[model samples]
Target: RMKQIEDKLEEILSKLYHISNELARIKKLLG
Candidate 1:
């Protein structure tokens, strides 16, 4: 039914989280 949208939203959030994590790491390294 609406599972497709749900799955896509999950992936989007996962990717956003990963990007946020990478940014944090980069900032830590730069500091």
Candidate 2:
């Protein structure tokens, strides 16, 4: 169970990192 939770959290972090990169790109384009 704990391992499952860890895996889920890691997946979320990966998505969040991807989103942040996208936003950074957009911000750079806009500026």
Candidate 3:
């Protein structure tokens, strides 16, 4: 169960990382 939790967290973190990167790029374009 702990391993499954870590796996899910890793997936979520990667998704958030990509989302933040995308947001930063969009902000740069707007600025």
Candidate 4:
């Protein structure tokens, strides 16, 4: 159970990182 939670959190972090990169790119483009 603990391992499963860790895996899920990691997956969420990956998606958030991806979105963070995308937002950074868009912000630079806007400026």
Model 3: which residue pairs collide?
none
Q: Rank candidates, TM-score, best first.
A: 2, 3, 4, 1
Q: On residues 1-31, what C-alpha lDDT tens digit does candidate 3 reach at each position?
A: 9999999999999999999999999999999
Instruction: Give me the displacement of residue 3 in model 4, in angstroms.
Output: 0.8
- lDDT of each structure? 0.98, 1.00, 1.00, 1.00
Error of 1 at 7 (Å): 0.7
Candidate 4 Cα errors over 4 Å, as ranges: none
TM-score of 2: 0.89
- TM-score, every prediction: 0.81, 0.89, 0.86, 0.84
lDDT of 1 by residue, 1-31 (tens): 5999999999999999999999999999999
Quote the lDDT for 5 in model 1.
92
Q: What tens-digit string does per-residue lDDT give for candidate 2 at 1-31? A: 9999999999999999999999999999999
lDDT of 3: 1.00
Best by TM-score: 2
User: Which consecutive 10 residues in model 2 have the weakest lDDT in total?
Assistant: 1-10
Off by more than 4 A, model 3: none
